[PDB]
Structure 1
Amino acid sequence: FKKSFTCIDMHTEGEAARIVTSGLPHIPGSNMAEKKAYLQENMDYLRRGIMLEPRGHDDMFGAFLFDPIEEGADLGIVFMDTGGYLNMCGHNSIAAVTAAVETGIVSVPAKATNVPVVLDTPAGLVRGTAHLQSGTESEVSNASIINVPSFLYQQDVVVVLPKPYGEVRVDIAFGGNFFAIVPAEQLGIDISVQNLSRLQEAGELLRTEINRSVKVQHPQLPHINTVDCVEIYGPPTNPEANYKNVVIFGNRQADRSPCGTGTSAKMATLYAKGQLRIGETFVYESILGSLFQGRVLGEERIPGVKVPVTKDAEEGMLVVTAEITGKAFIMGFNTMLFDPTDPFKNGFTLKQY
């Protein structure tokens, strides 16, 4: 138990969510964003040992739990992946809400049907609900999150990528992370496992180039000023779904889930274009066939605050409240071990350059 961490290993519809429940020292920071920055700046080897081979792998994802800081929250959470720390994550939020109830972190009131679980994240407060299985104490049927405010940021941004991709037109939207949203048709490849390595490559190229050429800034959270995810979308395979997508992020890893923050950013974009009404269910499919359900539950304009998309004819920037629903499973309870003489105590990747 020398250097050890305890993990609730979960997945949300195929996407990993390794929830680290114990093992950290005190992490300085007066909010969750500072605690994230502390880990990144001072203890990044932890993320690497927990996320990467041999203990993890190139498409691993997870989070560290903390005591809540913000008033009203049940749990503090910092997300991590193979390349860095996202400000929010829908699939891991869904998993954390589920684990909080299944493992007893949060109590179930007698005869409750739904149990609130509020997450204090680097992007803000995420209000979750675990929907209980009919005849049970704490068995979770599925879980919903009300995301932090999402918004379209900038439209029809032309990004110049090298051959074979060339010029590509994207939207930038915020769904807890900044996304570039791009039709797969523009990249000349369809969403499939056959194309997954090219989709990864195309997503890395796109992210790199837009962060070079376009400076983004969340108007309410100064620390959010990069595009961290690329959402590549196209026509659905499952007739229950409106669209399919794959999100590329981290060290060009791919989300196996439909991506909760990416679903929020998509819904905000569609809502801004008049294509979704309040309460309307949007169903996003993943590369694996997984589904998430979203609804926009509210909109607001914020006078005197604008983003590049905001027209002069509008009073202020449009933001929306998105709810995302999906299902997570506990797939293990792990005690992770780090022997000081282990040459890969800090993990490794064989992913090309």
Structure 2
Amino acid sequence: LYFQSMKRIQIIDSHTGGEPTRLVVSGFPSLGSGTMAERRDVLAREYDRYRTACILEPRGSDVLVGALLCEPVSPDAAAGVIFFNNSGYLGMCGHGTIGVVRTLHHMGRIGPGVHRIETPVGTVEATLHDDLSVSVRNVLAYRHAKDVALDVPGYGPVRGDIAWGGNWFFLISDHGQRVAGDNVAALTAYASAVREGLERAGITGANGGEIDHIELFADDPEHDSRSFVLCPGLRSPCGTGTSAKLACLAADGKLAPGAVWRQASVIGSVFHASYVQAEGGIVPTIRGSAHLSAEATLLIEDDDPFRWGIV
């Protein structure tokens, strides 16, 4: 009676280098048995309130990426997923997939090895390593423009690359900033000023793509690079910028196909990557670690005005 006064959605939360992913294990309505793309179309049209319940406050946050677990079409896939966020439905998500694969191991569904995950944009290949880190083959990445110059209000001129790695990035090495975990405020201020400069100048990705991620790179004594990424807003989910960086290295002849590249973030998260050439860019494979944060049942009470999230 009271029990029946609220819906239940079972979830498992993880984070990959501090970016959160929420895997919905059960509690969404049936979306039929077509491809992930077709199931996503049903979810988006018939049951979008379930996305908002899971992602929006008070149950989630604007930086949260969600993934709905689905039984895949092919029996040789470990799972099917549909990714979503506070704005809508996504295609592929790199750091999210690391979370998903780690979570599937936590649930006891898979052991170390190669696994295929169905998505609305195609089947993703991933390797679960013995240490439970995951190598994920991401979408096609490429550099749109090299050494694009602008004046950063309050700081001065800089050049950077415009690159696509599932998100539009402006990538800068010669920024004069100290890239370290104890300097995030100064870095954030710099990168925000950069994004504003791009706006003012009307600098975009291909087809007017909004460059909403800024990445600052620096030498590092232990890795090939130390980076800081500024995420959309001051809000939407954040990439780590590894794929975009690889596309620039590849285009400049600094890194061959197959060569291993190692990047660390200012908060200490480490990523190892390689790429293979493809038509119109590179296909990068990125290894990273996700950690578990919670198992939960979200509760959606009939009389809660924000039961489907606060909009």
Fold similarity call, TM over 0.5: yes
Percent identity among equivalent residues?
A: 30
**Are the structure 2 counterparts of residues 3 and 294 from structure 1 closer, same or farther at C-alpha, using a change threshold of 3 Å?**
same
Deviation at 1:18, TM superposition (A): 0.9
Corresponding residue to 1:244 among 206, 227, 230: 227
Matches within 5 A, 1:200-211: 201=192, 205=196
Q: Residue 51 and residue 241 in structure 1: after superposition, are their counterparts in 2 closer, same or farther (change >3 A)?
A: farther
Using the TM superposition, give the Cα deviation of residue 274 of structure 1 relative to its aligned residue in structure 2, in angstroms. Answer: 0.5
Structure 1 distance, partners of 2:159, 2:96, is 29
Report the 3-state secondary structure (helix = DSSP H, G, I; strand = E; otherwise coil) of the residue aligned with 2:77.
coil
1:336 aligned residue (298, 301, 304)? 298
1:294 to 2:273 alignment: yes
Aligned residue runs from structure 1 range 33-52, under 5 A = 33-36=37-40, 39-40=43-44, 43-52=47-56
Partner of 1:275: 254
Q: Which runs of 5+ in 1 are unaligned?
A: 109-113, 134-140, 218-224, 303-316
Structure 2: segments with no counterpart, 5+ residues: none
Structure 2 distance, partners of 1:216, 1:29, is 35
Residues of 2 paired with 1:122 and 1:202: CA distance?
A: 35
CA contact 1:181–1:232 (8 Å) conserved in 2: yes
Measured against aligned partners, the alpha-carbon deviations of 1:20-66 in whole angstroms (never above 9, x if no partner) come to: 11111133795434544554565444333322332223433321122
CA distance in 2, matches of 1:320, 1:127: 15
Indicate if the aligned counterparts of 2:170 and 2:211 stay in contact, CA closer than 8 A: no
Distance 1:100 1:118, change over 3 A: same
CA distance 1:156–1:70, change in 2 (3 Å):
farther
Deviations 1:74-117 (CA, angstroms, capped at 9, x unpaired):
322222334444322211111111222331333x4xxxxx4222
Deviation at 1:187, TM superposition (A): 10
Q: Does 1:3 align with 2:16?
A: no
User: What's the counterpart of residue 169 of structure 2?
Assistant: 180
Query: 1:334: how far off?
Result: 0.6
Per-residue CA distance 1:110-135 (angstroms, 9 max, x = gap):
xxxx42221222343221111125xx
Q: What's the offset of the Cα at 1:270? A: 0.9
SS at match of 1:152: strand
1:278 shift after superposition = 2.5
Distance 1:53-1:283 versus aligned 2 partners, 3 A rule: same
Q: Counterpart in 2 of 1:171?
A: 161
Given that residues 126 and 147 in structure 1 are in contact (C-alpha distance below 8 angstroms), is that contact kept between their aligned partners in structure 2? Answer: yes
Matches within 5 A, 1:1-353: 2-27=6-31, 30-36=34-40, 39-40=43-44, 43-69=47-73, 73-106=77-110, 108=111, 114-133=112-131, 141-157=132-148, 163-164=153-154, 170-175=160-165, 177-183=166-172, 192-195=183-186, 198=189, 201=192, 205=196, 214=204, 216=206, 226-227=209-210, 229-236=212-219, 239-249=222-232, 252-253=235-236, 255=238, 259=240, 262-296=241-275, 298-300=276-278, 302=279, 317=280, 319-348=281-310
What TM-score, normalized to structure 2? 0.79
Q: Is the 8 A contact 1:62 1:79 kept in 2?
A: yes
Paired AA for residue 127 in structure 2? T
Read off the aligned partner of 2:285 and give its amino acid letter: E
TM-score by length of 1: 0.71
Cα separation, 2, equivalents of 1:68 and 1:3: 25
Amino acid at match of 1:120: E
1:233-279 Cα deviation digits (max 9, x unpaired):
22156633413131413783464xx72xx211211221111111233
**2: CA distance, partners of 1:289 / 1:282:** 16
Equivalenced residue count is 305
Question: Is the CA contact (8 Å cut-off) linking 2:179 and 2:218 kept in structure 1?
Answer: no
